């Protein structure tokens, strides 16, 4: 009972938390395009030079 409970505990959490690394990784990576567009607005200032 207890070793199967431990086993299920580790199985349920490893199929969770580090897979759920997609949260920090995803919403971290998505900083890319939504910082990036400072470039698409950089060109308008060059147009204002």
């Amino acid at each position: 009972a207890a070793v199967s409970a431990l086993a299920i505990g580790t199985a349920g959490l490893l199929s969770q938390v580090p897979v759920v690394g997609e949260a920090m990784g995803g919403l971290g990576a998505i900083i890319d395009a939504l910082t990036m567009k400072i470039d698409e607005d950089a060109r308008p200032a060059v147009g204002s030079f």
Binding site: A1, V3, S4, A5, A7, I8
Partner: protein
């Protein structure tokens, strides 16, 4: 004189000997059950 009683009164013991040896065979055969559930109820630890 006790020529008859000595020969018969041992067999009444031998009877109980047969029965108690039978009980021994039954109780010892019970050893084949002793850890049986004891392994199978643990074994879902393997599957987990």
């Amino acid at each position: 004189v006790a020529i008859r009683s000595e020969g018969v009164s041992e067999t009444q013991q031998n009877l109980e000997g047969v029965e108690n040896a039978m009980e021994d065979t039954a109780d010892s055969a019970g050893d084949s059950a002793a850890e049986l559930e004891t392994f199978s109820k643990r074994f879902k630890g393997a599957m987990g």
